[PDB]
Amino acid sequence: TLDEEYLDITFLTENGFVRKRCPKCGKHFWTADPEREICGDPPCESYSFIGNPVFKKPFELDEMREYYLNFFERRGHGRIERYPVVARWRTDIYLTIASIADFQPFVTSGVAPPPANPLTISQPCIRLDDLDSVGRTGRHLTLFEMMAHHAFNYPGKEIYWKNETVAYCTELLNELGVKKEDIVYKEEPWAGGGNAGPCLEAIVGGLEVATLVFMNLEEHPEGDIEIKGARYRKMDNYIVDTGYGLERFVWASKGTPTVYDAIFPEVVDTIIDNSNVSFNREDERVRRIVAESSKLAGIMGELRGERLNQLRKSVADTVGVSVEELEGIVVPLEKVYSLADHTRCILFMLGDGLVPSNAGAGYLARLMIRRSLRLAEELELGLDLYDLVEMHKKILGFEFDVPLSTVQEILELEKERYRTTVSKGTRLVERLVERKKKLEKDDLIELYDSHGIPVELAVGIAAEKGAEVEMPKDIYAELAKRHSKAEKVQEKKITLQNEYPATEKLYYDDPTLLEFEAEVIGVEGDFVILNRSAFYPESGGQDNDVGYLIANGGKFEVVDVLEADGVVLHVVKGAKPEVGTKVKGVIDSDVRWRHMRHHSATHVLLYSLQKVLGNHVWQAGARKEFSKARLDVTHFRRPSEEEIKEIEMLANREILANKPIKWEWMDRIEAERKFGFRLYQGGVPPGRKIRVVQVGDDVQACGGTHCRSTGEIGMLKILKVESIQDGVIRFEFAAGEAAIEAVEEMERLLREASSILRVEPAKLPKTVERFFEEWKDQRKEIERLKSVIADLWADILMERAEEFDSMKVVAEVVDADMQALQKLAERLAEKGAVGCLMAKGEGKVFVVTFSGQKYDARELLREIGRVAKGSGGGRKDVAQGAVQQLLDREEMLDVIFRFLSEHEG
Amino acid sequence: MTLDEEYLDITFLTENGFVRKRCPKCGKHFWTADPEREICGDPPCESYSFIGNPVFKKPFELDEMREYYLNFFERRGHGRIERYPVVARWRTDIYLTIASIADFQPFVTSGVAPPPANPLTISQPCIRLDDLDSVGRTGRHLTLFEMMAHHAFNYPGKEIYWKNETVAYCTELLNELGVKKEDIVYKEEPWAGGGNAGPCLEAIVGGLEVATLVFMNLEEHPEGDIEIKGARYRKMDNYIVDTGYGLERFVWASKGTPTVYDAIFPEVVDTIIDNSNVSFNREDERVRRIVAESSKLAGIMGELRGERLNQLRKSVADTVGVSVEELEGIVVPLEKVYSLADHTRCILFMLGDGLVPSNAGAGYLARLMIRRSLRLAEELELGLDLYDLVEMHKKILGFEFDVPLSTVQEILELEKERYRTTVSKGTRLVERLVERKKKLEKDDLIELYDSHGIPVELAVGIAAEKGAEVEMPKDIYAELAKRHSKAEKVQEKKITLQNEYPATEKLYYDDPTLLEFEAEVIGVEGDFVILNRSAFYPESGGQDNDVGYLIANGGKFEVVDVLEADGVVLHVVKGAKPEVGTKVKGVIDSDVRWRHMRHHSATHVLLYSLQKVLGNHVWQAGARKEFSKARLDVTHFRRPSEEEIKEIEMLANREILANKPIKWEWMDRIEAERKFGFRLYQGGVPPGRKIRVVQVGDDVQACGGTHCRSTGEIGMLKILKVESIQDGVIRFEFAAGEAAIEAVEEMERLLREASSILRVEPAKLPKTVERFFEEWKDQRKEIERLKSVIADLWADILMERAEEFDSMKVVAEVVDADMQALQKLAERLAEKGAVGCLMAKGEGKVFVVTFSGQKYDARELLREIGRVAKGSGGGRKDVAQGAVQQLLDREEMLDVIFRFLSEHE
RNA sequence: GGGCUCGUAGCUCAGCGGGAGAGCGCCGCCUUUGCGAGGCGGAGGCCGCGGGUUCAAAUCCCGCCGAGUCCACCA
Ligand SMILES: C[C@H](N)C(=O)NS(=O)(=O)OC[C@H]1O[C@@H](n2cnc3c(N)ncnc32)[C@H](O)[C@@H]1O
Ligand SMILES: C[C@H](N)C(=O)NS(=O)(=O)OC[C@H]1O[C@@H](n2cnc3c(N)ncnc32)[C@H](O)[C@@H]1O
Ligand SMILES: [Mg+2]
Ligand SMILES: [Mg+2]
Ligand SMILES: [Mg+2]
Known about the structure:
2 copies of one chain form a homodimer.
Chain A: H1 3-6, H2 10-16, E1 18-21, E2 28-31, H3 61-73, E3 78-79, E4 119-126, E5 143-153, H4 162-176, E6 183-191, E7 195-204, E8 207-208, E9 210-219, E10 225-227, E11 230-245, H5 246-254, H6 259-263, H7 265-273, H8 284-295, H9 297-300, H10 306-319, H11 323-351, H12 361-379, H13 385-396, H14 404-436, H15 441-449, H16 455-465, E12 518-524, E13 527-530, E14 547-550, E15 555-558, E16 560-564, E17 567-571, E18 582-583, E19 585-587, H17 589-613, E20 619-625, E21 628-633, H18 641-657, E22 662-667, H19 668-675, E23 689-695, E24 698-701, E25 716-725, E26 728-735, H20 737-756, H21 764-799, E27 802-803, E28 808-814, H22 818-830, E29 834-840, E30 845-851, H23 857-868, E31 870-874, E32 878-883, H24 889-902
Parallel strand pairs in A: 3-4, 28-29
Antiparallel strand pairs in A: 1-2, 2-6, 4-5, 5-11, 6-7, 7-8, 7-9, 9-11, 10-11, 12-13, 12-18, 13-17, 14-15, 14-19, 16-17, 20-21, 21-26, 22-23, 23-24, 25-26, 27-28, 29-30, 30-32, 31-32
The structure holds '5'-O-(N-(L-alanyl)-sulfamoyl)adenosine (A5A) (2 copies) and magnesium ion (3 copies).
One '5'-O-(N-(L-alanyl)-sulfamoyl)adenosine binds next to strand 5, strand 8, strand 10 and helix 4 of chain B.
The structure holds one RNA strand.
C-alpha cells in the first residue's frame, strides 16, 4: 500500500541505495553502506558527530543560510524572504510551525499560485509541544529556522517530483562533504497543517538533520485514509516540502556538545557565569562528562524511567562518575539551555508583533515569559530576561517590526505581573495550610489551573511549613483535557434548500448608487434573493443596508438583509410578490452613509492606534451596530487618559486631511508583495482574487463598503475604552452623525443629573460628593439614634415585665419594623429578658423571640409558630420569623409560660 | 432760491395752462388751473369735499389700484421692482423705511451704486410713526401705508425725464381718472428726510393732499449752507426725481366713503365694532348721517386739541343739529376703532417682515405698536384677540410674508402675557407718584413707558382718579418713537492721527491659507508700525485679529496686536522697532488665523441653522470671539427649549458633515441683493460699489474676513451656553473644531467623575442621582422623627420613675442634656398631665426647667426653686425656663415640689 | 477558543442563610526605658452592580461589570 510510493524513488535503486528493516517491528529505511547494523537494542546509536565535525568546515548561522540559499538560488528556484512567526494569514493555527505553513492552504490546494516555483526560504518556526524535551535531548529548540525548497505541481505539469527533491538533498550534503555511505534515509508518515504525505527523514551522524514530505493528500471529512486521529483524502495535485534544520546543521559543522552551544554560545556562557551553578565551564572533568553525556542525549529523550537511571549509570561508569556527581551537572544544564532557548523564542514572538495575554495567541507568549522567569529564579540569574533577549538579537542580527524598547516594557510588565501573582497565590496557600492542615491533589490542580501556581511552590511551601503533601505527576492534564463537550458538528452557516448560480454585486467598484436595475429569481419563506445586489448584507455587527424594493405592482419592504454563499438574502416581513416581477431595489442613503463612515473610521482608528502606540498592535476583532462601533487591538496595558486623548486627536486630524481612498480587486500575490501582512487585519479572504481597500496609508483586505474620502466620515469620538483581556483592548467609537448624537446623548445625561440637584453642570461632581458624604453621615446618625430607641425601649418593657423566678418576661405587640424588633431583642437578651415581640407588617406579622439565659430562643419560636402558624430561625439569644396570625399578649404569655415550665428542674 | 428754475422751465407751469396765487393767512404759494376759484388744501383754510362725491370715474380696490398704477408707468417706460421690507436692513441711520426714496439712500442717491433700473416704479410700504397721534383723528393719516412712487436718477449728464415730464405723467393719470384739470391744486413746499431733501410740490385734490412730488439736489453735510428743519443741507452734484402716492388716499378718494379705513379695510373696522363695547350701531342711518358730516371736517380737528377743538366740535355739532356730549359718543370711540385697526395693520407688516419685540432696537418700535394696541383692546373690551384682526388683514391684502402666521401669533400671545404682568407691578408706582408729584408731566409720562412699560392711558386714568392734572402734548408718540428710533452710532475709540498716507493694501481676501508675505515698510508712529502691504487682520472688536513677527537683517520685531484707522493698517510692536524702507518678510501664526477661520465660518453656519430651525424672524444683534470661546446674538421672542437647542446643534453639525463649498468674491451691491435678498446684511452693511459676498452653504453674507473652504474643515460644532440678556435677543456661546473636542472631553470628564463617585455606569447616572437624592431627603425627615420619638419615649419613662402626690404624678430629675431638650420634653410632660422640675449641669451655669399639666403655675415653682439655688427665670402656666448657679439632689427637689403642691389648692 | 477562581474596613483576608468580623495600618490614653512596643479604647463598610429565591441574602441561584488563572487543536 504505502510502500508503493517509496520504492518508486529513482535515486534509491538506480543511483545507489537499498531498503532494509529493523529488529523491533518499527519501520523500513534506506542506506548506501551495505555493512553495518543497529544492535537490536532500541536506539543503539544516537550520535557520532559530537566531538567530530561531519562538515568540511565549521559554518556560522548566516553562512549556512547563505550557502543553502545560493546553492539553491543558482539552480533554478526563486528566493522568497521569510514570513513572520505569527500565522496572521491563517486562522487554524497561531504560529508558524513549518516552512510549508507559510503557503498553506490556498496555495497548497491550488487556489492561489505560489509567489515562485520552485521556491526556497529559511523560514523561522516555533514548536511548543517539545517543551519537555527541550534542554534535555540536546537537539530540540522552541524556536528554530527551517529552510526549504518547495515545488508546486499540478496534474500533468510538474516542476519536480520526488526524484529531484531527494537529489537536491543528496547533492547538498555531498557538496558539504558527508559521504553517501554515512547518510541514512528513514521513511515515515508526515501529517500537519491540513496536508500530509510520506516523508524521508535524513539522519546523519545519528541526528535527524532533514525531512522531505511528498504531499499527496489533504484533511477532509470523507477521510478514506486515516492518520493522527484526523481524516485525509487524496489530492488531484501534489506538492513537495523540504524541512532542513539549520541550528542542527551548524551543529554538525561545529561538533559542539549541544545545538545550543552551536547557535548561541555566548548567551549560555552569560547565563552560566552569572548564576548559581556550582561548577566551571572550563575544567576537564565537566568537559568529559558533557562530551559523553551529550553523546547519549538523543537516547535519553526516547527512553525514560527505570532505563533512564540505568543508562545514567552506564554513562556515569563510562566517565567514572558517582551517581550524585553527573546529574549534579546535567540537571542544572538542562535548565540553563531551556532558559537560553526560551529567551531566543521570546525575541521572535514579541518582535513579530505577538502581545502577551491571558488567553488566545498572546497566552503562548506569556507562557514562555513565565517559564523563562521560573528558570531564571531557579538559576538565581544576575541579569534580567531583557539582557538575554538583546544578546540573541545581536547574535542573529535580524531586524524586527517591533522595537526593542517596547519589548523591554513588555518584559518588565509581564515580570511585575508574575511577581504579583506568585505573591497573592503564595499567601493563599498559607491560608490553605492553616485551614486544612494538609495539601491534596484535587486542590493542587486548582492551585495551578486557577491561580497559576506551580506545584513546586505548593509543595515548596507546605514542606517549608511541614504541611502534608502528595505530588502526583501525569495528572495535570487529566481534568482540563478530558472533560470537554462540543455542541454543533455540521457546517457553520445555514445551508440552502436550493442552489442559485450567477450571483454578483456591483457595489464594489461604485458606492454612490443606492439604486439599481434587476430581475428576481427566488423566494423562500419570509426572505427573497435577486441576481445583482447593491444591497450589502449584515455582518456579525449590524452592518445592514436598509431600503425597499418596488415591484411593477407595489412598494415592498426590506427590513433586513443577510447572506449565504453565492446568494444574497433579503428578509421582508410583509407580502411576497413571488417570481414574476422585474424590480428596482432602492437602498436608504442614511444607513449606507453611516456604515461607510464607520468602516473608513475603523481603518482610521487602526492607523491612529499603531502610530500612537506601536507596530505591535494588530486587529483582534471588529463589529458594529446602530450608533455604535468597536475595534479590538493588541496592546499590553489599558492606555492612559493622555494616550487615548491624543489618539482621538490624531484620528480627527486624519479626518481633516481628507485623504483619497482607493480600492482595487487584485490577485493575492501582488498585494502580499506590496503591503506586507497588515493586509489581513480584517481576516483572511477566500478566492483567487481579493478586494483590496487602501485608505491612503493603511491598506487592508476588506469586502465592506467604504467612503470616497475621509472628510465625509465626519468627526470621530471614542465612546469607551475597555481591557477585554490582558493584551487585548477594545475601543468603542462612533463617527459621522452617529457620533454627534452619541455626544448629544452624553450631554443629556449630564444636564439631566445637574438639573436634579438644581446645579451648574460644571459643579456636579463636587456637589454629588458633598451629598454622598452627607448621605453616609445621615445614614450613620440614624443607626445611632435607632440604637437609642432600642435601649430606651428595653428599659420601658422590663418595668412592666412579669417576673418569673427572678427573670423578667416581656411579650408585646409593638409598632416597629423588623430591624427595630431585632435590635430591641438583642438589647433585651443582653439584659437577660425572656419572651417575644410582634409587629404588624405586610401580608404577614413579624415575630422576634429572645433570651439572655439558658433558655433557647429558637425552641421558643417553634412553640410560638405552633400557635401562630409561621416559621423562622436564629441564634440562642435572638430568633427572627414571620407568622400569619397576630396574637394578643395574653395568648403569647400563655405560650411563654408553657415554654418556661418545660425547662427547669 | 429755486423760483426761476422750476416756475417757468417746465412746459406745464406756464405753457400748459395754470396760475399761482398766495393767501396772506396761508403764507403759501399754490398752483391752480382754475383762476375762478382759490383754495389751499392745508388747514385751517380748507376741508375736503370729495367724500360722498367720488371724484374718480369708479371706486377701486387696493389690488386693482396698485397694479394699475404700476402698469401705467411700466407702459410709460419704467421698470417694476418688488416691495422692500418695512425694516431698513440696507442702511444704518434708521430702522424703518420712511419713504420710497429711503430704499435707495444713501448708496444709490449718492451715486455710489447704480439703480436697479431707470426709470422705475414701485409700491413701497412705509411706516411713519411721527404721525402716530394723528392716526384715527384726521381720518387721512396711517402709520403703515403703501406709497406708490416712480423714480429716476440723473447725474451731471444724462436724464430719463424731467419735472415737466413727471407732472405731465401725474396729470395724465389724474385727468384719466376723472379729476378735472381745473380743480387739482399744486401746493409749493420743501420736503426733507433720511439725509436727503429738496423743493417739492404737493398735489391736492378736493382738499386732500394725495400726491407729493419732490425734486432733490442736495445732501446732508456739515457745511449746510441751507437751513432745513434745523438740519444742515448742501447741494449735490447729481439731481433726482422722487415721487409719492398714497395708494390708500387714492382708493379712498375713489370709493367716496367717510374715513380712509372704511374703504381700504372696512372688514376690520366693522368687526371691531361688532365685538367691542361701543353702544351705537353703524348700520343705523341717523349715525351714518352724523359720521358723514363729522368726516367732512375730520381733517382739521385731527390737528386741533384742547378747547379750540371743543369749539370746532361745536361748530360742526350745530350744523348737523346734534349735541356735543352726544357727538363725543361717536367720535371718541370710533377714532379708537380706527387706531387699533391701522395699528394692527402696522403690526402685521412689522412682525411679518422679521421684527421681534424688545426693549431696544427696532424691536422697541414693534413692541410699542403692540403694547398700545393691547391698551386699545382693553379700552374697547374686545372679545377677540389681536391675531384675529392681523390674520384678517393678511387675507385682505394678499401679501405673502417672510414670517409665518403661527409665529406672529405666538409673539402676540406672549406679548400680552408680558403686558398684563408688567402693568400689575407698574400700577403701584402711579399710586405713589400721582399724589407725590401732585400733577403729571411730559417727562414723567415718557419715563413711565420707556422704563416701567406703562402705556399713557393707564397713567392718565389714575392721575385723574387721584385728583392730578395731566398735560399730554400733541404728538407725544412722536416723542417716544423719535427718542429711541435712531439706530445708535455704537461709536468706538478711533485714532487716525496724522501720518500723511492715503492708500494701503491687504492681501488676505483672495486666499486665507497663505501665511507668508513680503513687503516694504512705510510709516512708524509711536509704537505702532504701519505698512504699504500686509496679510494681517485688524479689528476694533478686540478679537479675531492676527498676531506674529517680522525678521529682517536688523533683528526681530514682534507684533502682538494689529489695528486699523480711516482704512489704514496699524502694527503694534514691543521689542525691536524696524527701520523705514526696509525689505521685510511678514509671518503670522498659523493657528491663530486657523482658530479664527474655524470660528468665522462656524458662526455663519450657526445663523443658518437658527434660521432653518426656529424661523425667519431670526437675525443678528452682534458677534464677538471672547478668547477660547465664541458668541452669537440673535433676535428671538423666547428662550429656546432644550429640544430646540438639540436640533440647532444637530442640523448645523449635519451641514458640517456635508462639507459644502464656501465661496468668497466681490459683487455689485444691486446684483448681490438681487440674487440673495437682504439677509446679506446680517453682519452689518458694507460700503463701496462692490462688496465681498460670502457663501457658507446656502447662507449668503457680506463679511470681509478669513474663512474656511469647506464646512468639514471646522469639524463638529459644540454649543457651550444659552442665555437671555434682554427680551427679544438671545445669546449663544459656541465652540468648533479643536476647542469643540476640548469642550466635549471636558463634558465627558465631568460625567465620568460624577458616575465614578457614585460607582455607576454613566448611562444610568441620572436615575441613580434622584434615588440618592430622594434617599437624602427621606432619611433627613426620618432623623427628626427619630429625635421626636426619643423625646416621646423619654417622657414616658419619667412618668414611671416619678412619684404620686394628690394623685398627680410628680417628677423631679437631673439629666445631662442641653436646653432645647429640656423644653421639648417638658412640653410633653405637661401634655401628659404631670408636674415637676428638671435640671442639667450645662457648661457654665446650671440649667433648670419646670412644668405643670394641671392648674398649678409653672412659673411659681421656678421662683421657689430658684430662691434655693440662687437664680431666676420666666415662663408660662404650662412650662417655665430658668438658669441657676447650683445643682440639686432629687430628694431636695421633692421638697419644693411637695411644699408647692401643698400650698396651692 | 474552552474551563475554573475571586470582588467584605486603607491593605491582606476569614466569614458562606437570621449579630458585619480578625491581623497589619491610622487616632488617643495608660503602663513601660525593653523607644520597642505592650495594655485599654476610638474612628473607618451602600459586603462591586442588576435581579430571582425565602419570613429572612454579605452568605444560595442567574445575568452584568471588574480583577485573575490554566488548558486548547503543532512527526
Ligand atoms: C517540512 C515538514 N513539514 C516538517 O516540518 N518536517 S519536520 O517537522 O521533521 O521538520 C524538519 C526539520 O526541522 C527541524 N526541526 C523540527 N523540529 C525542531 C525543533 N523542535 N527544534 C529544532 N529543530 C527542529 C529538524 O531539523 C527537522 O529535520
Ligand atoms: C415722496 C416723498 N418722499 C414723500 O414721502 N412725501 S410725503 O411725506 O408727503 O408722503 C408722500 C405720500 O405719502 C402719503 N402719506 C404721507 N404721510 C402719510 C400718513 N401719515 N398716512 C398715510 N399716508 C401718508 C401721502 O399720500 C403722500 O402724498
Ligand atoms: Mg480589598
Ligand atoms: Mg448581615
Ligand atoms: Mg501602642
